[PDB]
Scaffold this active site. Structure first.
Site, PDB file in Angstrom:
ATOM      1  CG  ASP A  63     -10.397 -12.956 -49.019  1.00  0.00           C
ATOM      2  OD1 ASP A  63      -9.393 -13.164 -48.299  1.00  0.00           O
ATOM      3  OD2 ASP A  63     -11.261 -13.822 -49.265  1.00  0.00           O
ATOM      4  CB  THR A  64      -4.895 -10.637 -47.817  1.00  0.00           C
ATOM      5  OG1 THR A  64      -5.268 -11.335 -46.619  1.00  0.00           O
ATOM      6  CG2 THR A  64      -4.985  -9.139 -47.581  1.00  0.00           C
ATOM      7  N   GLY A  65      -6.519 -13.402 -48.758  1.00  0.00           N
ATOM      8  CA  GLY A  65      -6.441 -14.817 -49.055  1.00  0.00           C
ATOM      9  C   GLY A  65      -6.997 -15.238 -50.402  1.00  0.00           C
TER      10      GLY A  65
HETATM   11  C1  LIG Z   1      -9.419 -20.465 -48.473  1.00  0.00           C
HETATM   12  C2  LIG Z   1      -8.579 -19.425 -49.234  1.00  0.00           C
HETATM   13  C3  LIG Z   1      -7.168 -20.000 -49.606  1.00  0.00           C
HETATM   14  C4  LIG Z   1      -9.286 -18.903 -50.490  1.00  0.00           C
HETATM   15  N1  LIG Z   1     -10.601 -18.303 -50.204  1.00  0.00           N
HETATM   16  C5  LIG Z   1     -10.665 -16.879 -49.612  1.00  0.00           C
HETATM   17  C6  LIG Z   1     -10.978 -16.909 -48.090  1.00  0.00           C
HETATM   18  O1  LIG Z   1     -10.699 -15.671 -47.551  1.00  0.00           O
HETATM   19  C7  LIG Z   1     -12.442 -17.252 -47.853  1.00  0.00           C
HETATM   20  C8  LIG Z   1     -13.402 -16.203 -48.395  1.00  0.00           C
HETATM   21  C9  LIG Z   1     -14.853 -16.492 -48.009  1.00  0.00           C
HETATM   22  C10 LIG Z   1     -15.474 -15.745 -46.987  1.00  0.00           C
HETATM   23  C11 LIG Z   1     -16.806 -16.002 -46.645  1.00  0.00           C
HETATM   24  C12 LIG Z   1     -17.510 -16.988 -47.291  1.00  0.00           C
HETATM   25  C13 LIG Z   1     -16.895 -17.727 -48.312  1.00  0.00           C
HETATM   26  C14 LIG Z   1     -15.563 -17.470 -48.665  1.00  0.00           C
HETATM   27  N2  LIG Z   1     -12.640 -17.292 -46.406  1.00  0.00           N
HETATM   28  C15 LIG Z   1     -12.823 -18.531 -45.656  1.00  0.00           C
HETATM   29  O2  LIG Z   1     -12.876 -19.583 -46.223  1.00  0.00           O
HETATM   30  O3  LIG Z   1     -12.940 -18.412 -44.277  1.00  0.00           O
HETATM   31  C16 LIG Z   1     -13.573 -19.469 -43.591  1.00  0.00           C
HETATM   32  C17 LIG Z   1     -12.728 -19.651 -42.157  1.00  0.00           C
HETATM   33  O4  LIG Z   1     -13.163 -18.614 -41.404  1.00  0.00           O
HETATM   34  C18 LIG Z   1     -14.645 -18.336 -41.879  1.00  0.00           C
HETATM   35  O5  LIG Z   1     -14.777 -17.124 -42.202  1.00  0.00           O
HETATM   36  C19 LIG Z   1     -15.397 -17.072 -43.708  1.00  0.00           C
HETATM   37  C20 LIG Z   1     -15.572 -18.301 -44.128  1.00  0.00           C
HETATM   38  C21 LIG Z   1     -14.808 -19.193 -43.205  1.00  0.00           C
HETATM   39  S1  LIG Z   1     -11.850 -18.660 -51.349  1.00  0.00           S
HETATM   40  O6  LIG Z   1     -13.100 -18.015 -50.974  1.00  0.00           O
HETATM   41  O7  LIG Z   1     -12.221 -20.095 -51.384  1.00  0.00           O
HETATM   42  C22 LIG Z   1     -11.271 -18.034 -52.985  1.00  0.00           C
HETATM   43  C23 LIG Z   1     -10.587 -18.836 -53.843  1.00  0.00           C
HETATM   44  C24 LIG Z   1     -10.148 -18.322 -55.064  1.00  0.00           C
HETATM   45  C25 LIG Z   1     -10.404 -16.998 -55.392  1.00  0.00           C
HETATM   46  N3  LIG Z   1      -9.952 -16.444 -56.697  1.00  0.00           N
HETATM   47  C26 LIG Z   1     -11.095 -16.195 -54.521  1.00  0.00           C
HETATM   48  C27 LIG Z   1     -11.524 -16.698 -53.320  1.00  0.00           C
END
Ligand SMILES: CC(C)CN(C[C@@H](O)[C@H](Cc1ccccc1)NC(=O)O[C@H]1CO[C@H]2OCC[C@H]21)S(=O)(=O)c1ccc(N)cc1
Lengths: 99, 99
Positions: B25-27
């Site tokens: 996860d690059t995000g």
């Molecule tokens: C929103 C970002 C700035 C940060 N996020 C990582 C992100 O990649 C999450 C990571 C993620 C992935 C799956 C489930 C929960 C979180 N993905 C996500 O929110 O995607 C959503 C939009 O498309 C859908 O696909 C997945 C969820 C939806 S995060 O999960 O909240 C996060 C925040 C801080 C840290 N240290 C690690 C992770």
């Protein structure tokens, strides 16, 4: 280009005639943008993240340009903490992970 | 290797002597793993994203192996729906974005 990850991979994108900064997010299935005025019809939808679910506006077949690469796909608009570019757009610009 | 984005970039990781599936996860600034009984001291932390915040336990100097690539750094443990490998570890294994 090749983008290392010692910093947040932020990029300037173009959507609806506006420039914005967005985060290239390989952990997002979908692309989600902060509140904005986008022209075109939309449909309500729910997406969930690490902290739960939110209400978004779904815009289909929306033009997006990322660092000179054009995409046409779905864009969700709602109370995301950050403009995130998900895999639905990243695949269109030929983005891959390599290590 | 090269990993495409048609599907979630899930890989096998090794941590605490256990193998698990995690998301490249690059995000994500930092690595966040599902609830697990890691030893040693820890500090509370809250991380936020779509849906709000979750409280996690921050362990430092944890060994993680990702498909043979060794890394040592911070690992957050909490009620995340998915095992997430963040940039803090992605840098150590030499991961890059390419398009
Ligand atoms: C929103 C970002 C700035 C940060 N996020 C990582 C992100 O990649 C999450 C990571 C993620 C992935 C799956 C489930 C929960 C979180 N993905 C996500 O929110 O995607 C959503 C939009 O498309 C859908 O696909 C997945 C969820 C939806 S995060 O999960 O909240 C996060 C925040 C801080 C840290 N240290 C690690 C992770």
């Amino acid at each position: 280009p090749q983008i290392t990850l010692w910093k947040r991979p932020l990029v300037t994108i173009k959507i609806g005639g506006q420039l914005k900064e967005a985060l290239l997010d390989t952990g997002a299935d979908d692309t989600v943008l902060e509140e904005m005025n986008l022209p075109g019809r939309w449909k309500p939808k729910m997406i969930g993240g690490i902290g739960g679910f939110i209400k978004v506006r779904q815009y289909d077949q929306i033009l997006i340009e990322i660092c000179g690469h054009k995409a046409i796909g779905t864009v969700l608009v709602g109370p995301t903490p950050v403009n995130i570019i998900g895999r639905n757009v990243l695949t269109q610009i030929g983005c891959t992970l390599n290590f």
